[PDB]
Ligand SMILES: O=P(O)(O)CP(=O)(O)O[C@H]1[C@H](OP(=O)(O)O)[C@@H](OP(=O)(O)O)[C@@H](OP(=O)(O)O)[C@@H](OP(=O)(O)O)[C@@H]1OP(=O)(O)O
Ligand SMILES: Nc1ncnc2c1ncn2[C@@H]1O[C@H](COP(=O)(O)OP(=O)(O)NP(=O)(O)O)[C@@H](O)[C@H]1O
Ligand SMILES: [Mg+2]
Ligand SMILES: [Mg+2]
Ligand SMILES: [Mg+2]
């Protein structure tokens with residue numbers, strides 16, 4: 184039996200999408216799934232972690248990525264989502280740089296770094312209705328993102344002609360994903376990316392890859408609108424159907440490969456007749472789609488079989 188090991192925090196390992204997909208992967212005749220216990224991940228040294236032939240492992244808040252890398256280095260499994268890239272995925276500047284090297288359209292942007300110790304003369308000039316970041320001008324509306332991709336306190340600043348102030352986004356709290364603030368001045372402590380605001384129809388497109396030739400997409404109301412979350416009779420956020428065009432399927436192919444994340448979530452903004460990547464999240468499952476569960480488990484099982492059946496002397500086509 185080929186062992187597929189699952190190494191992530193329990194909140195992810197025991198999530199509904201994860202349990203659904205793992206159940207289906209276990210249906211493969213020659214595959215056994217082993218889920219690493221959170222307590223083992225945190226408290227046991229890597230030498231005591233279970234063995235596996237294929238490792239599916241991914242960082243989220245509180246995950247010891249250092250240990251996961253050390254484990255992979257030690258046991259040399261077939262890695263589905265590259266671990267070293269997950270350091271870069273935590274930094275929006277690194278994400279953006281990769282996207283650019285790959286010829287992927289993204290919002291025009293500029294980085295404002297503040298070395299905390301440095302004599303605080305930032306490369307930032309602020310006007311009533313714009314900012315200048317290292318000489319580059321962003322007219323309101325513009326977007327201000329913390330350089331940490333884990334920091335969801337993304338602000339949007341409105342022009343005086345729309346009444347000024349700002350929209351402060353955050354990781355969803357029940358009925359709400361953003362709130363309006365009368366504050367018009369940018370944040371003065373921290374490092375940020377400033378980007379041009381891309382006009383969409385009011386929805387974000389969320390893309391989920393399973394290898395570079397499979398991508399499920401769906402749309403949700405942008406948090407940058409008013410911030411009221413739309414929920415269904417079951418208390419789950421309303422999603423809208425999406426089919427990616429040829430250019431977008433290519434974007435998904437590139438993102439998956441460039442970031443070496445077989446399973447990869449990213450967001451697209453459909454604006455000005457094009458599609459812009461504004462965020463690459465790394466490992467993420469589609470939630471509450473049974474067809475996704477079927478597809479994703481079959482693809483991953485097939486990836487595992489194709490890669491490992493030969494050395495295990497197992498018949499595979
Ligand atoms: O309890 P609620 O409000 O009904 C759902 P949440 O905001 O608590 O979960 C989100 C989760 O948020 P949370 O941390 O609150 O579980 C976050 O995780 P985080 O990035 O670690 O915060 C992501 O989970 P993944 O790790 O699966 O990507 C999100 O997945 P997407 O990016 O939207 O696909 C989840 O959003 P979902 O799609 O479930 O609404
Ligand atoms: N350049 C932009 N133009 C217009 N809207 C934007 C832009 N960047 C971000 N937004 C909106 O702000 C939301 C949050 O931005 P994003 O870069 O996805 O932050 P995040 O904190 O990484 N979110 P998550 O998907 O949970 O990781 C997006 O889904 C868009 O609706
Ligand atoms: Mg099995
Ligand atoms: Mg994540
Ligand atoms: Mg939550």
Ligand SMILES: [Mg+2]
Pocket residue numbers: 450462
């Ligand atoms: Mg996003």
Ligand SMILES: [Mg+2]
Pocket residue numbers: 332462463464
């Ligand atoms: Mg993100």
